[PDB]
Amino acid sequence: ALGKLQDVVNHNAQALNTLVKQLSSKFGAISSVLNDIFSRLDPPEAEVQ
Amino acid sequence: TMSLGAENSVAYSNNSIAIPTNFTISVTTEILPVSMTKTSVDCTMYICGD
Amino acid sequence: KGLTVLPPLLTDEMIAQYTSALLAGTITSGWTFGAGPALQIPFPMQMAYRFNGIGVTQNVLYENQKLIANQFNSAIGKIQDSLSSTPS
Amino acid sequence: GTGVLTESNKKFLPFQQFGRDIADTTDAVRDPQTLEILDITPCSFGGVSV
Amino acid sequence: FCGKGYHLMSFPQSAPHGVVFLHVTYVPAQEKNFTTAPAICHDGKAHFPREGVFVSNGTHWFVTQRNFYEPQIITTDNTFVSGNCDVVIGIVNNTVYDP
Amino acid sequence: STECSNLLLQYGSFCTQLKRALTGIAVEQDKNTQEVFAQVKQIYKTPPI
Ligand SMILES: *[C@@H]1O[C@H](CO)[C@@H](O[C@@H]2O[C@H](CO)[C@@H](O)[C@H](O)[C@H]2NC(C)=O)[C@H](O)[C@H]1NC(C)=O
Ligand SMILES: *[C@@H]1O[C@H](CO)[C@@H](O[C@@H]2O[C@H](CO)[C@@H](O)[C@H](O)[C@H]2NC(C)=O)[C@H](O)[C@H]1NC(C)=O
Ligand SMILES: *[C@@H]1O[C@H](CO)[C@@H](O[C@@H]2O[C@H](CO)[C@@H](O)[C@H](O)[C@H]2NC(C)=O)[C@H](O)[C@H]1NC(C)=O
Ligand SMILES: *[C@@H]1O[C@H](CO)[C@@H](O[C@@H]2O[C@H](CO)[C@@H](O)[C@H](O)[C@H]2NC(C)=O)[C@H](O)[C@H]1NC(C)=O
Ligand SMILES: *[C@@H]1O[C@H](CO)[C@@H](O)[C@H](O)[C@H]1NC(C)=O
């Protein structure tokens, strides 16, 4: 009966969960963790990553 | 193949009318979303953290 | 290249059937079918009710029924010609 | 990482060292030398409205 | 717009992130067939209903409101005269009572 | 290309978001047609005359 309101709540929660999940994406870099990038590379290539 | 509806043939003629003799008080529900969750994102913390 | 077009759930035949049902309801029953059970009414009495809705007395419709029917038929024919004759 | 290290009640298995949240950032860690499990909570933050 | 049927009134109810409208509507029911005419011919004059419709249960003619069956005697109070009986298609002959 | 798909997996749930948005649009079109045309539950027919 109350599918419309629950649907709106689901879309908002799902969008937030996807946005949080996207931090786990390398995006074509060696790692998804910034601290690792500093701890492992020189600034000329770390800047690129 | 899904049915559109039950088939009803209206008894149309040029000199006959159908008049209601009774009534039903029907209460129906309409659910409408009004607002969403208000979300704020810290751009610097999300992209870079600490 | 990965693109698919999904068919509509309602086919053109069923949409046409729905329009046919709506036309049959509005012709044989007036506005009664939209508010409840379809109650039959003669079409010259339905048109008189509609004339009363816009503030014209029933006698005006009944006395001039043939002229109004001719005007309506002419207008419907003009609509078909206008749609057939205009690209835009 | 930058965070507050607190006591935890999560029953880590013997092989398990650290923990990851939905985002995959580390949320708990097992310290060397002492083998204890420390929960990592990000430091206090929020929006300032004037 | 405000429920299925002829709308009477509506009630608002709060809901999480939303509103629920309870639409109270009037639905006609228990319809009955009647023989109808556009006008009543009396004394060489055509009588039309002021607010209702002419109905017949088989032998007698009455005027009733369109949305509920309440037959009343055809009088000059609830009918109006426009023209003679020669123009209206389907006019029937019946007496019109005078108060 | 299998290697391209393997590199595409590094980007996360972008593909899922695109598919879900298109699925929402696709069901929305059917819902729109249903709202416009399916306003009667009785299929009426005209008399033969
Ligand atoms: C008014 O009369 C008509 C016919 O005189 C009735 O229509 C018939 O209804 C039955 C039962 O639903 C059907 O089996 C017939 O096929 C219908 N005939 C036609 C010509 O449509 C109608 O039901 C009557 N109305 C009421 C309210 O009783
Ligand atoms: C109009 O319909 C109502 C029901 O909606 C009828 O009321 C019922 O009447 C019977 C006997 O008269 C009772 O046993 C029921 O309990 C009544 N129902 C309710 C909800 O009150 C009413 O009689 C009908 N009127 C006419 C003139 O037919
Ligand atoms: C149509 O309705 C009228 C009025 O309700 C009926 O006339 C009455 O019928 C009852 C029962 O037969 C008599 O006791 C009354 O004396 C009648 N009144 C008058 C003024 O004549 C009429 O019988 C109904 N016709 C049908 C076919 O049902
Ligand atoms: C209604 O009444 C009128 C007048 O009483 C009828 O008109 C007459 O009909 C007869 C037979 O058709 C003719 O010979 C007369 O010349 C008509 N007179 C007038 C003034 O037109 C009419 O036929 C009646 N209609 C019904 C259905 O009974
Ligand atoms: C209704 O139709 C019948 C035949 O179909 C005809 O004899 C009668 O005169 C018509 N009545 C009206 C008012 O059109």
Coordinates of C-alpha atoms and ligand atoms in Angstrom, one line a residue:
Chain A
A1 CA 0.0 0.0 0.0
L2 CA 2.8 2.4 1.0
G3 CA 5.1 1.6 -1.8
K4 CA 5.6 5.2 -3.1
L5 CA 7.1 6.5 0.2
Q6 CA 9.2 3.4 0.8
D7 CA 10.4 3.7 -2.8
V8 CA 11.6 7.2 -2.2
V9 CA 13.4 6.2 1.0
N10 CA 14.9 3.2 -0.9
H11 CA 16.2 5.5 -3.7
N12 CA 17.8 7.9 -1.3
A13 CA 19.4 5.2 0.8
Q14 CA 20.6 3.3 -2.2
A15 CA 22.1 6.4 -3.7
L16 CA 24.0 7.1 -0.5
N17 CA 25.2 3.5 -0.3
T18 CA 26.4 3.6 -3.9
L19 CA 28.2 6.9 -3.2
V20 CA 29.9 5.3 -0.2
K21 CA 30.7 2.2 -2.2
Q22 CA 32.4 4.2 -5.0
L23 CA 35.3 5.1 -2.6
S24 CA 36.4 1.4 -3.1
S25 CA 37.1 2.0 -6.8
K26 CA 40.7 2.4 -8.1
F27 CA 39.6 4.6 -11.0
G28 CA 42.6 3.3 -13.0
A29 CA 45.1 3.9 -10.3
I30 CA 47.4 1.5 -8.4
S31 CA 45.3 1.7 -5.2
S32 CA 42.1 3.2 -3.9
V33 CA 43.8 4.3 -0.6
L34 CA 45.4 7.7 -0.7
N35 CA 47.7 7.0 2.2
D36 CA 49.2 4.0 0.4
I37 CA 49.8 6.2 -2.6
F38 CA 51.8 8.7 -0.5
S39 CA 53.6 5.9 1.4
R40 CA 54.7 4.1 -1.8
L41 CA 55.5 6.6 -4.6
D42 CA 57.5 9.7 -5.3
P43 CA 55.5 13.0 -5.7
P44 CA 55.8 13.2 -9.6
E45 CA 53.9 9.9 -10.0
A46 CA 51.9 10.0 -6.7
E47 CA 50.4 13.3 -7.9
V48 CA 49.2 11.5 -11.0
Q49 CA 47.7 8.7 -8.9
Chain B
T1 CA -1.7 -12.5 -22.7
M2 CA -3.0 -10.1 -20.0
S3 CA -6.7 -9.2 -19.9
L4 CA -7.5 -5.5 -20.1
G5 CA -10.7 -5.8 -18.2
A6 CA -14.0 -7.6 -17.8
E7 CA -16.2 -7.3 -20.8
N8 CA -19.3 -5.2 -20.3
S9 CA -21.8 -4.3 -23.0
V10 CA -23.9 -1.2 -22.2
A11 CA -27.5 -1.6 -23.1
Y12 CA -27.8 1.5 -25.2
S13 CA -31.1 2.4 -26.8
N14 CA -32.6 5.6 -28.1
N15 CA -35.3 5.9 -25.4
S16 CA -34.1 4.2 -22.3
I17 CA -32.2 5.6 -19.3
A18 CA -30.7 4.0 -16.2
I19 CA -31.3 5.9 -13.0
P20 CA -29.5 5.0 -9.7
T21 CA -31.8 4.0 -6.8
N22 CA -29.1 3.8 -4.1
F23 CA -25.6 5.0 -3.3
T24 CA -22.4 3.8 -1.7
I25 CA -20.1 6.1 0.3
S26 CA -16.7 5.1 -0.9
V27 CA -13.5 6.1 0.9
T28 CA -10.3 5.6 -1.1
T29 CA -6.6 6.2 -0.3
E30 CA -4.2 8.4 -2.3
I31 CA -0.5 8.3 -1.2
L32 CA 1.7 11.2 -2.4
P33 CA 5.4 11.7 -1.6
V34 CA 6.0 15.3 -0.4
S35 CA 9.7 15.5 0.7
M36 CA 12.9 13.6 0.6
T37 CA 15.8 13.0 2.9
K38 CA 17.9 16.2 3.2
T39 CA 21.5 15.2 2.5
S40 CA 24.7 17.1 2.9
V41 CA 28.0 15.9 1.6
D42 CA 31.4 17.2 2.8
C43 CA 33.2 17.4 -0.5
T44 CA 36.7 17.6 0.9
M45 CA 36.3 14.8 3.4
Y46 CA 34.6 12.5 0.8
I47 CA 37.2 13.0 -1.9
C48 CA 40.3 13.2 0.3
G49 CA 39.5 12.1 3.8
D50 CA 42.3 13.1 6.2
Chain C
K1 CA 26.9 -2.4 -29.7
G2 CA 25.0 -3.4 -26.6
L3 CA 21.8 -1.4 -27.3
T4 CA 18.4 -3.1 -26.9
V5 CA 15.0 -1.6 -27.3
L6 CA 12.5 -3.2 -25.0
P7 CA 8.9 -3.6 -26.4
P8 CA 6.2 -1.7 -24.6
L9 CA 4.1 -3.7 -22.2
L10 CA 0.9 -2.6 -23.9
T11 CA 0.8 -3.3 -27.6
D12 CA -0.9 -0.9 -30.1
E13 CA -3.9 -3.2 -30.3
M14 CA -4.5 -3.1 -26.6
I15 CA -4.1 0.7 -26.4
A16 CA -6.6 0.9 -29.3
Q17 CA -8.9 -1.5 -27.4
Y18 CA -8.7 0.8 -24.3
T19 CA -9.5 3.8 -26.4
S20 CA -12.4 1.9 -27.9
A21 CA -13.7 1.0 -24.4
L22 CA -13.4 4.7 -23.4
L23 CA -15.3 5.8 -26.5
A24 CA -18.0 3.3 -26.0
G25 CA -18.4 4.3 -22.4
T26 CA -18.5 8.1 -23.2
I27 CA -21.0 7.5 -26.1
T28 CA -23.4 5.1 -24.5
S29 CA -23.1 6.2 -20.8
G30 CA -21.9 9.8 -20.8
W31 CA -19.9 10.6 -17.7
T32 CA -21.6 7.9 -15.5
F33 CA -19.0 5.2 -16.3
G34 CA -16.1 7.3 -15.0
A35 CA -17.8 7.9 -11.6
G36 CA -19.3 4.4 -11.1
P37 CA -21.3 1.9 -13.0
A38 CA -22.1 2.7 -16.6
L39 CA -25.6 4.0 -16.8
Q40 CA -27.1 4.1 -20.3
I41 CA -28.6 7.4 -21.6
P42 CA -29.7 8.4 -25.1
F43 CA -27.0 10.5 -26.8
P44 CA -29.4 13.5 -27.5
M45 CA -30.1 13.5 -23.8
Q46 CA -26.4 13.3 -22.9
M47 CA -25.7 16.3 -25.2
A48 CA -28.6 18.2 -23.6
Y49 CA -27.0 17.5 -20.2
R50 CA -23.7 18.8 -21.5
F51 CA -25.5 21.9 -22.9
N52 CA -26.9 22.4 -19.4
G53 CA -23.3 22.1 -18.0
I54 CA -22.1 25.1 -20.1
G55 CA -25.2 27.1 -19.2
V56 CA -27.4 26.5 -22.2
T57 CA -31.0 25.2 -21.7
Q58 CA -32.0 21.8 -23.0
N59 CA -34.6 23.2 -25.4
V60 CA -31.8 24.8 -27.5
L61 CA -30.2 21.3 -28.0
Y62 CA -33.5 19.5 -28.7
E63 CA -35.0 22.1 -31.1
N64 CA -31.7 22.3 -33.1
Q65 CA -30.6 18.6 -32.8
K66 CA -30.2 18.0 -36.6
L67 CA -28.1 21.2 -37.1
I68 CA -25.8 20.3 -34.1
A69 CA -25.4 16.7 -35.4
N70 CA -24.6 18.0 -38.9
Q71 CA -22.1 20.5 -37.4
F72 CA -20.4 17.8 -35.3
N73 CA -20.1 15.4 -38.3
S74 CA -18.7 18.2 -40.5
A75 CA -16.2 19.1 -37.8
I76 CA -15.0 15.5 -37.4
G77 CA -14.6 15.2 -41.2
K78 CA -12.6 18.5 -41.1
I79 CA -10.4 17.0 -38.4
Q80 CA -9.6 14.0 -40.5
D81 CA -8.8 16.1 -43.5
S82 CA -6.7 18.5 -41.4
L83 CA -4.6 15.7 -40.0
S84 CA -4.2 14.1 -43.4
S85 CA -3.2 17.4 -45.0
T86 CA -0.7 18.8 -42.5
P87 CA 2.8 17.4 -42.1
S88 CA 3.4 19.3 -38.8
Chain D
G1 CA 45.1 6.7 9.1
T2 CA 43.7 9.4 11.4
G3 CA 41.2 8.3 14.0
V4 CA 40.4 7.5 17.6
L5 CA 41.5 4.1 18.9
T6 CA 38.9 2.6 21.2
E7 CA 38.2 -0.8 22.8
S8 CA 36.1 -3.2 20.7
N9 CA 33.7 -6.0 21.4
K10 CA 34.0 -7.6 17.9
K11 CA 35.0 -11.3 18.2
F12 CA 37.8 -11.5 15.7
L13 CA 38.8 -14.9 14.5
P14 CA 42.5 -15.9 15.1
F15 CA 43.6 -15.4 11.4
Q16 CA 41.7 -12.1 11.2
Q17 CA 43.8 -8.9 11.7
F18 CA 41.9 -5.9 10.5
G19 CA 38.3 -5.1 9.4
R20 CA 36.8 -3.3 6.5
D21 CA 33.5 -1.4 6.1
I22 CA 31.2 -1.0 3.1
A23 CA 33.5 1.6 1.6
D24 CA 36.6 -0.8 2.1
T25 CA 38.4 1.7 4.4
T26 CA 39.9 0.0 7.5
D27 CA 37.6 0.3 10.5
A28 CA 39.4 -1.9 13.1
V29 CA 43.0 -3.1 13.3
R30 CA 45.0 -5.6 15.4
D31 CA 48.1 -4.0 16.9
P32 CA 51.4 -5.8 16.6
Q33 CA 53.5 -6.9 19.7
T34 CA 50.4 -7.0 21.9
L35 CA 47.9 -8.7 19.5
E36 CA 44.9 -6.6 20.9
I37 CA 42.1 -5.5 18.6
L38 CA 41.6 -1.7 18.5
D39 CA 38.5 -0.2 16.9
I40 CA 39.2 2.8 14.7
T41 CA 36.5 5.5 14.7
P42 CA 37.0 8.7 12.5
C43 CA 37.6 11.9 14.5
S44 CA 34.6 14.2 15.3
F45 CA 33.4 16.3 12.4
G46 CA 30.3 18.2 11.3
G47 CA 29.0 21.1 9.4
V48 CA 29.2 24.7 10.8
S49 CA 26.2 26.9 10.0
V50 CA 26.4 30.6 10.9
Chain E
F1 CA -8.8 14.2 -9.1
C2 CA -10.1 13.5 -5.6
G3 CA -11.0 9.8 -5.8
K4 CA -13.1 7.5 -7.9
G5 CA -16.7 8.7 -8.0
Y6 CA -18.5 11.9 -7.4
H7 CA -16.3 13.7 -4.8
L8 CA -17.8 14.7 -1.5
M9 CA -14.9 15.6 0.8
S10 CA -11.3 14.6 1.7
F11 CA -9.3 14.1 4.8
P12 CA -5.5 14.6 5.1
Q13 CA -3.3 12.2 7.0
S14 CA 0.4 12.7 7.7
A15 CA 2.8 10.0 6.6
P16 CA 6.6 9.7 6.6
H17 CA 7.8 12.0 3.8
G18 CA 4.3 12.2 2.5
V19 CA 0.6 12.8 2.7
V20 CA -2.3 10.3 2.5
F21 CA -5.6 11.6 1.3
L22 CA -8.8 9.7 2.3
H23 CA -11.2 10.7 -0.4
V24 CA -14.9 10.3 0.5
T25 CA -16.9 10.0 -2.7
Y26 CA -20.4 9.2 -3.7
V27 CA -20.8 6.1 -6.0
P28 CA -24.2 5.5 -7.6
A29 CA -25.6 2.0 -7.1
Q30 CA -28.6 -0.3 -7.7
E31 CA -29.5 1.3 -11.0
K32 CA -32.8 0.6 -12.7
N33 CA -34.0 0.9 -16.3
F34 CA -36.7 3.5 -17.2
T35 CA -38.2 4.7 -20.4
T36 CA -37.1 8.2 -21.1
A37 CA -38.3 11.1 -23.3
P38 CA -36.7 14.5 -24.1
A39 CA -39.9 16.5 -23.6
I40 CA -43.5 16.1 -22.5
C41 CA -46.2 17.4 -24.9
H42 CA -49.1 19.0 -23.1
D43 CA -51.7 21.4 -24.6
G44 CA -49.7 21.8 -27.7
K45 CA -46.6 22.9 -25.7
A46 CA -43.3 21.2 -25.1
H47 CA -42.3 20.9 -21.4
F48 CA -38.6 20.3 -20.5
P49 CA -37.3 19.4 -17.0
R50 CA -35.8 22.3 -15.1
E51 CA -33.3 20.2 -13.2
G52 CA -34.2 16.5 -13.8
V53 CA -35.1 14.0 -16.4
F54 CA -38.4 12.5 -17.5
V55 CA -38.7 8.8 -16.7
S56 CA -41.4 6.2 -17.1
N57 CA -41.8 3.0 -15.1
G58 CA -44.1 1.5 -17.8
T59 CA -47.4 3.3 -17.5
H60 CA -46.8 6.6 -15.7
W61 CA -44.5 9.5 -16.4
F62 CA -42.5 11.3 -13.7
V63 CA -39.6 13.7 -13.4
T64 CA -36.6 12.7 -11.2
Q65 CA -33.2 14.1 -10.4
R66 CA -30.5 12.7 -12.6
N67 CA -28.2 11.1 -10.0
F68 CA -30.9 9.5 -7.7
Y69 CA -34.2 7.9 -8.4
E70 CA -36.9 10.1 -6.8
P71 CA -40.0 10.2 -9.0
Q72 CA -42.2 13.3 -8.8
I73 CA -45.3 14.3 -10.6
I74 CA -44.7 16.4 -13.7
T75 CA -46.0 19.8 -12.9
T76 CA -45.4 23.4 -14.0
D77 CA -43.1 24.0 -11.0
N78 CA -40.4 21.6 -12.2
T79 CA -40.8 22.0 -16.0
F80 CA -40.4 24.9 -18.3
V81 CA -42.2 25.5 -21.6
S82 CA -40.3 26.3 -24.8
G83 CA -42.1 26.0 -28.2
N84 CA -44.7 23.6 -29.5
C85 CA -44.6 19.8 -29.9
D86 CA -43.7 19.8 -33.6
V87 CA -39.9 20.4 -33.4
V88 CA -38.6 18.1 -30.6
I89 CA -37.7 14.6 -31.8
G90 CA -39.1 11.9 -29.5
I91 CA -41.6 14.0 -27.5
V92 CA -44.3 12.0 -25.8
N93 CA -47.9 12.9 -24.8
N94 CA -48.6 13.2 -21.1
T95 CA -50.5 15.5 -18.8
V96 CA -48.8 18.2 -16.9
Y97 CA -50.4 19.0 -13.5
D98 CA -51.1 22.5 -12.4
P99 CA -50.8 23.4 -8.7
Chain F
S1 CA 37.9 -7.8 -25.0
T2 CA 38.3 -9.8 -21.7
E3 CA 41.2 -7.6 -20.6
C4 CA 39.0 -4.5 -21.0
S5 CA 36.3 -6.0 -18.9
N6 CA 38.9 -6.9 -16.2
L7 CA 40.1 -3.2 -16.2
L8 CA 36.4 -2.1 -16.2
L9 CA 35.8 -4.1 -13.0
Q10 CA 38.2 -1.6 -11.2
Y11 CA 35.6 1.2 -11.6
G12 CA 33.0 -0.5 -9.4
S13 CA 29.2 -0.2 -9.7
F14 CA 28.9 2.4 -12.5
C15 CA 27.4 -0.2 -14.8
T16 CA 24.8 -1.1 -12.2
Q17 CA 23.8 2.5 -11.7
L18 CA 23.3 3.0 -15.5
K19 CA 21.3 -0.2 -15.8
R20 CA 19.2 0.6 -12.8
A21 CA 18.4 4.1 -14.1
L22 CA 17.4 2.8 -17.5
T23 CA 15.3 0.1 -15.9
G24 CA 13.5 2.8 -13.9
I25 CA 12.9 4.8 -17.0
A26 CA 11.6 1.6 -18.8
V27 CA 9.1 0.7 -16.1
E28 CA 8.1 4.4 -15.9
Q29 CA 7.1 4.4 -19.6
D30 CA 4.8 1.4 -19.0
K31 CA 3.4 3.1 -15.9
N32 CA 2.8 6.3 -17.9
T33 CA 0.8 4.3 -20.6
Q34 CA -1.1 2.5 -17.8
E35 CA -2.1 5.8 -16.2
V36 CA -3.2 7.5 -19.4
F37 CA -5.1 4.6 -21.0
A38 CA -6.1 2.0 -18.4
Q39 CA -8.6 4.3 -16.5
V40 CA -11.5 1.8 -16.9
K41 CA -11.7 -1.8 -15.7
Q42 CA -14.7 -2.6 -17.9
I43 CA -14.1 -3.0 -21.6
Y44 CA -17.2 -1.4 -23.1
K45 CA -18.5 -2.0 -26.6
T46 CA -20.9 0.0 -28.7
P47 CA -24.3 -1.5 -29.7
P48 CA -24.4 -3.0 -33.2
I49 CA -26.9 -0.3 -34.4
Ligands
LIG1 C1 -31.9 -2.7 -18.9 O1 -32.4 -3.5 -19.9 C2 -31.4 -4.2 -20.7 C3 -32.1 -4.9 -21.8 O2 -33.4 -4.5 -21.9 C4 -30.5 -5.1 -19.8 O3 -29.4 -5.5 -20.6 C5 -29.2 -7.0 -20.6 O4 -28.6 -7.4 -19.4 C6 -28.4 -8.8 -19.3 C7 -27.8 -9.2 -18.0 O5 -26.6 -8.4 -17.7 C8 -27.6 -9.3 -20.5 O6 -27.5 -10.7 -20.5 C9 -28.2 -8.9 -21.8 O7 -27.4 -9.2 -22.9 C10 -28.4 -7.4 -21.8 N1 -29.1 -6.9 -23.0 C11 -28.6 -5.9 -23.8 C12 -29.4 -5.6 -25.0 O8 -27.6 -5.3 -23.5 C13 -30.0 -4.3 -18.6 O9 -29.3 -5.2 -17.7 C14 -31.1 -3.6 -17.9 N2 -30.6 -2.8 -16.8 C15 -30.8 -3.1 -15.5 C16 -30.2 -2.1 -14.5 O10 -31.5 -4.0 -15.2
LIG2 C1 -29.5 1.0 -0.1 O1 -28.3 0.3 0.2 C2 -28.1 0.1 1.6 C3 -26.8 -0.6 1.8 O2 -25.7 0.1 1.3 C4 -29.3 -0.7 2.2 O3 -29.1 -0.8 3.6 C5 -29.2 -2.2 4.0 O4 -30.6 -2.5 4.2 C6 -30.8 -3.9 4.6 C7 -32.3 -4.1 4.7 O5 -33.0 -2.9 4.5 C8 -30.1 -4.2 5.9 O6 -30.2 -5.6 6.2 C9 -28.6 -3.8 5.8 O7 -28.0 -4.0 7.0 C10 -28.5 -2.4 5.3 N1 -27.1 -2.0 5.1 C11 -26.5 -1.0 5.7 C12 -25.1 -0.8 5.4 O8 -27.2 -0.2 6.4 C13 -30.6 0.1 1.9 O9 -31.7 -0.6 2.4 C14 -30.7 0.3 0.4 N2 -31.9 1.1 0.1 C15 -32.8 0.8 -0.8 C16 -33.9 1.7 -1.0 O10 -32.6 -0.2 -1.6
LIG3 C1 -45.6 3.4 -11.8 O1 -45.6 4.2 -10.6 C2 -46.9 4.6 -10.2 C3 -46.7 5.5 -9.0 O2 -45.7 4.9 -8.1 C4 -47.8 3.5 -10.0 O3 -49.1 4.0 -9.8 C5 -49.7 3.5 -8.5 O4 -49.6 2.0 -8.4 C6 -50.1 1.5 -7.2 C7 -49.9 0.0 -7.3 O5 -50.5 -0.6 -8.4 C8 -51.5 1.9 -7.0 O6 -52.0 1.4 -5.7 C9 -51.7 3.4 -7.0 O7 -53.0 3.8 -6.9 C10 -51.1 4.0 -8.3 N1 -51.2 5.4 -8.4 C11 -51.7 6.1 -9.4 C12 -51.7 7.6 -9.3 O8 -52.3 5.5 -10.3 C13 -47.9 2.6 -11.3 O9 -48.7 1.5 -11.0 C14 -46.5 2.2 -11.7 N2 -46.5 1.4 -12.9 C15 -45.9 0.2 -13.0 C16 -46.0 -0.5 -14.4 O10 -45.2 -0.3 -12.1
LIG4 C1 -49.9 13.5 -29.3 O1 -51.1 14.3 -29.4 C2 -51.2 15.0 -30.6 C3 -52.4 15.9 -30.5 O2 -53.4 15.4 -29.6 C4 -51.3 14.0 -31.8 O3 -51.3 14.7 -33.0 C5 -52.4 14.3 -33.9 O4 -52.2 13.0 -34.4 C6 -53.2 12.5 -35.3 C7 -52.8 11.1 -35.7 O5 -51.5 11.0 -36.2 C8 -53.4 13.4 -36.4 O6 -54.5 13.0 -37.2 C9 -53.7 14.8 -35.9 O7 -53.8 15.7 -37.0 C10 -52.6 15.3 -35.0 N1 -52.9 16.6 -34.5 C11 -51.9 17.6 -34.3 C12 -52.4 18.9 -33.8 O8 -50.8 17.4 -34.7 C13 -50.1 13.1 -31.7 O9 -50.2 12.0 -32.7 C14 -50.0 12.4 -30.4 N2 -48.8 11.6 -30.3 C15 -48.8 10.4 -29.7 C16 -47.5 9.6 -29.7 O10 -49.8 9.9 -29.2
LIG5 C1 -35.9 4.9 -31.6 O1 -35.6 3.9 -32.6 C2 -36.7 3.2 -33.2 C3 -36.2 2.2 -34.1 O2 -34.8 1.9 -34.0 C4 -37.7 4.2 -33.8 O3 -38.9 3.5 -34.2 C5 -38.1 5.2 -32.8 O4 -38.9 6.2 -33.4 C6 -36.8 5.9 -32.2 N1 -37.2 6.9 -31.3 C7 -36.5 8.1 -31.1 C8 -37.0 9.0 -30.1 O5 -35.5 8.3 -31.8

